Every structure is written in C-alpha cells, then in structure tokens.
Amino acid sequence: GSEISKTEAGQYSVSAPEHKGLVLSGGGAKGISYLGMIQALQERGKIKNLTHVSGASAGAMTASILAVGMDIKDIKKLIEGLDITKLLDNSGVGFRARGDRFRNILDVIYMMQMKKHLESVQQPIPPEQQMNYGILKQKIALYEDKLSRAGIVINNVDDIINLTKSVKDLEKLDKALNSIPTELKGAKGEQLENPRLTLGDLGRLRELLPEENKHLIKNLSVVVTNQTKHELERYSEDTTPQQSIAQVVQWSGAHPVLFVPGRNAKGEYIADGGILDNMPEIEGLDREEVLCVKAEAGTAFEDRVNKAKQSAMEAISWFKARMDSLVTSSVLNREKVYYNIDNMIYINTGEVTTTNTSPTPEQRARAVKNGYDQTMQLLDSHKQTFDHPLMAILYIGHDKLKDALIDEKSEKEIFEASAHAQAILHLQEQIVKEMNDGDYSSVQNYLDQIEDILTVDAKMDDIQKEKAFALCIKQVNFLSEGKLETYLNKVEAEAKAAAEPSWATKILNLLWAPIEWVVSLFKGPAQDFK
Amino acid sequence: ICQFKLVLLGESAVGKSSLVLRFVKGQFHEYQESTIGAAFLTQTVCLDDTTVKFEIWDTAGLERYHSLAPMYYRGAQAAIVVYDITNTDTFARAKNWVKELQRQASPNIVIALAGNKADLASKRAVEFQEAQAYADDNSLLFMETSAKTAMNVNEIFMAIAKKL
Numbered sequence: 001g002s003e004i005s006k007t008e009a010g011q012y013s014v015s016a017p018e019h020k021g022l023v024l025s026g027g028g029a030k031g032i033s034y035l036g037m038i039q040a041l042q043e044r045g046k047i048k049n050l051t052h053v054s055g056a057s058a059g060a061m062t063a064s065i066l067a068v069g070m071d072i073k074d075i076k077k078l079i080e081g082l083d084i085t086k087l088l089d090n091s092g093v094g095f096r097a098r099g100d101r102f103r104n105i106l107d108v109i110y111m112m113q114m115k116k117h118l119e120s121v122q123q124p125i126p127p128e129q130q131m132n133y134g135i136l137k138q139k140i141a142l143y144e145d146k147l148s149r150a151g152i153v154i155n156n157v158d159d160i161i162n163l164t165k166s167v168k169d170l171e172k173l174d175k176a177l178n179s180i181p182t183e184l185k186g187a188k189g190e191q192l193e194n195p196r197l198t199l200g201d202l203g204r205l206r207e208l209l210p211e212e213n214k215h216l217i218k219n220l221s222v223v224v225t226n227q228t229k230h231e232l233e234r235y236s237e238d239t240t241p242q243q244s245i246a247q248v249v250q251w252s253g254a255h256p257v258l259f260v261p262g263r264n265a266k267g268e269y270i271a272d273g274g275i276l277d278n279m280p281e282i283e284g285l286d287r288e289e290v291l292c293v294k295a296e297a298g299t300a301f302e303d304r305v306n307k308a309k310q311s312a313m314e315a316i317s318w319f320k321a322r323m324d325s326l327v328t329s330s331v332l333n334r335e336k337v338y339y340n341i342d343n344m345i346y347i348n349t350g351e352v353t354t355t356n357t358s359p360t361p362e363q364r365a366r367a368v369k370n371g372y373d374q375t376m377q378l379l380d381s382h383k384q385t386f387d388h389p390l391m392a393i394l395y396i397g398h399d400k401l402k403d404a405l406i407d408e409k410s411e412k413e414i415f416e417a418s419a420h421a422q423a424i425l426h427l428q429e430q431i432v433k434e435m436n437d438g439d440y441s442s443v444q445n446y447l448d449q450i451e452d453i454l455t456v457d458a459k460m461d462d463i464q465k466e467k468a469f470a471l472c473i474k475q476v477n478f479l480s481e482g483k484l485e486t487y488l489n490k491v492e493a494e495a496k497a498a499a500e501p502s503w504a505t506k507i508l509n510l511l512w513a514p515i516e517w518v519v520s521l522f523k524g525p526a527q528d529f530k
Numbered sequence: 531i532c533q534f535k536l537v538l539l540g541e542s543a544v545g546k547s548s549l550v551l552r553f554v555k556g557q558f559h560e561y562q563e564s565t566i567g568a569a570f571l572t573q574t575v576c577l578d579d580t581t582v583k584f585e586i587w588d589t590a591g592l593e594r595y596h597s598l599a600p601m602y603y604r605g606a607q608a609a610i611v612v613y614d615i616t617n618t619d620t621f622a623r624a625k626n627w628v629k630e631l632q633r634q635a636s637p638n639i640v641i642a643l644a645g646n647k648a649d650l651a652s653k654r655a656v657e658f659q660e661a662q663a664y665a666d667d668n669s670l671l672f673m674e675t676s677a678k679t680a681m682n683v684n685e686i687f688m689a690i691a692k693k694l
C-alpha cells in the first residue's frame with residue numbers, strides 16, 4: 001500500500017515504511033550492545049509506532065524495559081550502569097547462580113515504571129475500567145509492602161542501580177520478594193491471580209492510559225528453552241497473560257553455564273532462549289513491518305560483511321569482463337531484481353565477547369557506537385528515491401504499490417507512469433510465455449517495444465533508460481529461469497560466426513550490468529565502482 | 531507467421547472489451563468490469579493458407595486515458611474505433627479518434643469503424659446509412675457488430691487481415 005511522491009527537487013521518493021514490531025536475538029550478547037540500537041530508533045522515531053516487541057537472552061530484558069515504556073534517558077542510565085555479574089547469587093561456593101536475585105531487580109525495575117504510569121492516569125476511573133486499576137494497585141502495594149519491610153525505597157532509577165552495588169541491601173531484597181509465591185491456588189484448585197506483575201498487567205495498564213499515550217506500552221513476548229521438552233517456548237501478553245514478566249525474562253536469560261535451570265508451571269526445566277542462535281517471530285505481523293536485530297561475534301561479523309563486499313565487487317568485475325570480452329553465466333551471483341526491504345540489524349559485539357570477563361569503558365562505548373551506526377546505516381536503506389517514476393514502479397512490485405490508475409486524485413505523472421509499467425509487464429510476461437512454448441521469434445520485437453515505451457512515452461534520459469531497460473531484461477531473464485540469456489548467447493555467437501553485428505549485443509550488455517548501478521541514483525554510465 | 535499490432539479505441543461502455551472476449555474466447559458477460567489502463571492478448575487466426583498473429587491492445591475509454599493513447603497506436607498496423615448505436619455522442623467521439631488516428635498514427639494503418647450494440651435496434655440512435663456514409667468518405671472499414679449475438683465480430687477482424 002505504498003505511494004510514490006515527487007520531491008522538492010524533481011525526484012521520486014516512495015512512502016517510508018512503517019515498522020510496528022521489534023525482535024532481539026538470543027545470543028551471547030550483553031545488554032550494552034542494544035543501547036546504541038535503541039538510541040538510534042529514538043533519534044529517528046522508529047519506536048513510538050511500535051505495537052509489539054520481542055526478545056530472547058539479553059534481548060528479552062532489553063525488550064522488557066521497552067515494553068514498560070521507560071524513558072530513553074533512564075534506559076541509558078539503566079543499561080550502561082547495570083553489570084549482570086553483580087546480580088549473581090550462588091547458593092554457595094562451587095554452585096551455579098540461583099537466578100532469584102536477577103529476577104528481583106527486574107521486578108523492582110518494572111514496579112517503579114509501572115507505578116509512574118498509574119500516576120499519570122486521570123481519576124476517576126470508568127466502570128468497565130474499574131477492575132483493571134484495582135488489580136495493578138493491589139500488586140504494587142505488595143511490592144512496596146515487602147520493600148518497606150526491608151528498608152528500601154524505590155521511586156528513582158538510580159536507586160535501583162546503587163542497590164546492586166550493595167550486597168547488604170541486595171540480600172535484604174532477596175528475603176523480601178522471594179516470599180511472594182509463584183502460583184496461588186485453592187478450592188476448587190482454580191488458579192488465582194498471580195501476585196506478581198504479569199505480561200497481562202502490561203495490557204491492563206495500557207487500557208487505562210489515554211489513547212494519547214497508549215503507545216508507551218508494547219506487547220511483550222519472550223522465548224525460552226525447555227530443557228525437558230528439548231524445544232523452544234514462547235510467552236506472550238496474548239498467549240500467556242498470567243505469566244510474570246520478571247520470571248520469563250530471567251528465564252530467557254538464564255544461561256545454564258551461569259544459572260541453574262528454571263521451573264516451569266509443570267516443573268519442566270527452563271533455560272536461556274538463545275543457547276543456540278535463534279530469531280523469534282512476532283505472531284500477527286508481516287515480515288516487512290518487523291525490525292530484526294542480531295548480535296554476531298567479531299569474526300562472524302566481519303566474515304559476513306567481507307563476503308558481501310566481495311560479491312559486490314564481482315558484480316562490477318563480471319560486467320567489465322563482458323565488455324572486455326568484446327574486442328560464465330548470469331547466475332553469478334545473488335542478484336535480486338525485485339525490491340525486498342532489509343530489516344536485519346547486525347551488531348558487532350567485538351571485544352565484548354562472551355569470553356571477556358570484564359570489558360573496559362573504552363570497548364564498551366565501542367560496542368554502542370557500532371550498534372548506533374549499523375542501526376542508522378540500515379534505516380538509511382529504507383529511504384527509496386529514484387530519478388524517474390517508472391523506475392520505481394518497475395523495481396518495486398506494482399503489487400506493493402497503491403494502484404494509481406484506480407485513484408482519481410493520483411498525479412497524472414504517476415498515473416501515466418503506471419500505465420507505462422503495465423504495458424511493459426504485459427510484454428514481459430509474453431516473452432516468458434512464448435519462450436517456454438519454444439517460440440523465440442518475437443522476443444526482439446517485444447523488447448524493442450519495451451525500450452520504445454521507456455524512451456518515447458516515459459521520456460527517460462539516455463542514461464536513466466539504460467538502467468530501466470537493463471532491469472526489464474534482468475527481470476525477464478529471471479522469470480524465464482535463464483531461457484533468455486541462453487538464447488541471447490546463441491544469436492550473438494551465430495552472428496560472430498558470420499562476421500555481422502547483432503541485436504543480442506546490447507541486450508546481453510545490459511543483462512550483465514551491475515544491479516547495484518541500475519537501482520542507484522548514480523548519474524554516470526557503467527563505471528559505477530563502489 | 532505474419533505478426534501485427536491491433537488496438538481497440540472508443541468511448542467507455544461501447545463494447546471494446548467484450549468484442550475481444552467474443553473474438554477470442556467466444557463468450558459474453560452482461561456485467562463486465564471496466565478496463566483499467568489496457569489489457570493485452572494475442573489471438574492467432576489463419577486466412578487462406580497463411581497464418582497471421584494479432585497483438586491486440588484493448589484500451590480504456592475514459593477521458594483520462596486519452597493522453598496514454600499514442601503509446602498504444604504507435605506501432606499499430608490496425609485500429610478498431612468502436613462506438614454505440616444507442617448513443618449518438620459515442621459515434622461523435624469516434625470521429626475524433628479517426629481524425630486523431632489519421633493525424634498521428636502510421637499513414638499505412640488499417641483503420642476500421644464499428645457500430646456496436648447493434649442488437650439494441652430498439653434503442654438505436656445512430657443511422658446505419660449515416661455511418662456507412664461517413665466511413666466511405668473517410669476510407670474506413672465499417673460494419674455493425676454485436677458481442678451479444680456474435681454478429682460481425684469475427685467478420686470485422688478478418689476483414690482487416692485481408693488488407694494486412
């Protein structure tokens with residue numbers, strides 16, 4: 001449902017995509033690595049329009065303090081100044097961590113921010129809304145009860161931070177909150193409301209807030225590993241609303257190396273959701289409206305970037321190899337000829353490896369800037385712009401665009417360029433239809449008509465029509481599973497064995513043009529480079 | 531295999547898209563959708579012992595699509611201008627298409643003229659003697675077609691092939 005808009009300088013930008021989802025990978029990443037990514041999404045305002053948020057491992061935690069609607073200033077103070085290593089509570093020497101202390105800091109974080117959201121609500125409270133306010137108010141009381149019984153007051157973010165810096169106040173915290181049961185029952189064995197803030201309380205809070213500010217609370221979903229069932233479990237606001245947030249977040253980040261496994265509501269064993277690398281999927285959304293974030297190792301990062309810089313150099317090389325052939329087939333390599341959005345954010349952990357016991361603030365702010373620059377670099381790949389409107393309708397699917405022919409108020413220039421596009425497509429689909437039948441007679445005829453539309457009706461520049469025609473050729477070559485290129489290779493070879501110029505010469509040249517050049521705004525001929 | 535490009539022009543709701551269905555699939559729908567932009571087909575018939583192939587372009591008849599016309603008749607060797615006999619103005623518009631065809635299209639184009647909805651003689655508004663006159667004056671190929679009764683549909687197309 002995209003549109004094409006003429007810019008202030010005569011170019012044609014397409015409607016910016018809207019992302020309503022965000023998912024963080026389960027890996028050996030530290031929470032500091034997601035700091036620069038959030039800082040970036042704030043700076044570009046990609047966060048406000050998010051409805052859902054997902055996470056595993058350290059992402060499950062980071063995605064939880066986003067779903068709670070914590071201000072970006074507090075997150076920066078929270079994420080930067082919170083070493084998980086501090087929150088390790090071994091049962092004794094030689095044992096793995098309980099995982100009860102990390103779970104308790106999460107509850108404090110949540111209760112502090114879920115409280116400051118209830119203070120913003122306008123009293124009184126509607127009848128059908130009367131209940132939801134009661135339950136949330138009751139739970140915070142329980143939390144503030146136990147905390148008052150230990151002598152810790154939490155109404156600031158920095159209070160949570162230095163709390164961690166003192167074992168005395170930490171053990172006070174463990175004795176207080178652990179008293180709260182995990183599962184209330186009673187005759188007739190019916191489940192009673194969980195005394196802790198649950199995933200569903202995120203939904204209760206949001207219904208309370210005005211539509212003006214209902215965007216502060218996101219739909220949280222985390223993924224864990226079921227060590228008993230040997231598979232992955234997903235806890236969501238919609239699916240498991242009776243599940244505590246602090247429980248599943250600690251669970252999803254409970255690496256079996258550092259933490260003992262958790263206890264499912266059946267007693268099943270539960271650990272980190274990213275023991276193996278895994279990218280959760282947000283149910284109810286499409287792929288093109290979800291930002292995906294994956295933290296890779298330093299070696300794993302550079303390896304992927306280099307194999308991409310390589311296959312982009314060969315693209316130019318193979319073209320020059322074809323022009324120097326004058327005076328080994330076009331399935332080399334990975335040439336995508338229709339537009340598909342790239343939502344994958346890769347973050348370089350670098351020196352903050354899972355092996356690095358303690359990283360310097362030097363190499364910490366390094367891991368942040370990578371996530372910032374890389375998140376910015378990706379968002380800069382969503383801004384589509386073209387020199388001619390037909391190039392946009394051809395490169396981007398017309399199934400992915402708002403039909404301008406139907407629209408009565410669509411600009412004539414776009415309305416015309418769309419008709420120019422369906423005519424070419426009609427011809428394109430015929431060349432494919434006839435070649436598969438075995439008839440290669442009117443292939444040159446149809447292509448001549450295509451080029452004629454680009455140069456007479458579209459009135460493209462001589463250089464921006466080369467890119468347009470090349471794309472049209474590349475697309476047909478794709479839709480025919482290579483039947484065009486092979487036929488083009490025979491005609492040209494059967495014309496050199498007769499010492500005569502051919503039409504297949506220019507069609508094959510464009511067929512070998514770098515795709516990185518045809519969809520570019522490069523104002524020059526195929527000396528694109530990189 | 532002699533391949534030629536054909537284009538149906540005319541005001542909307544005259545029967546252009548239905549003539550193509552009758553000429554190709556030999557069907558007819560009383561509730562046809564309106565053509566958006568233009569639809570593309572290829573139909574192969576053989577006059578005598580020689581095969582011919584049409585590159586048919588059924589255009590949209592609305593006033594907006596008028597600026598997109600030269601794209602459709604630039605390489606056309608034939609053009610069917612379709613009007614309605616139950617509407618004098620549709621026929622009056624057909625005169626503009628022909629006169630525009632003569633000006634801008636190929637000089638060696640086989641322009642045809644067709645008075646469609648000829649089964650609706652009950653509500654007939656244009657006179658056959660008049661259109662036959664205007665056609666004969668303008669070197670056209672005039673028939674009376676009807677996609678509702680298959681009348682002169684196959685006849686007008688092949689009559690163009692004879693001149694091709």
Ligand SMILES: Nc1nc2c(ncn2[C@@H]2O[C@H](COP(=O)(O)OP(=O)(O)NP(=O)(O)O)[C@@H](O)[C@H]2O)c(=O)[nH]1
Nearest residue numbers: 542543544545546547548560564565591647676677
């Ligand atoms: N009685 C009768 N009705 C016809 C005839 N040809 C078409 N119609 C009717 O006229 C209507 C319009 O048909 P259509 O072919 O879509 O006209 P068009 O010129 O293609 N319209 P557009 O160009 O806007 O798509 C339909 O309801 C169809 O049944 C004909 O020969 N006789």
Ligand SMILES: [Mg+2]
Nearest residue numbers: 546547565589
């Ligand atoms: Mg039509």
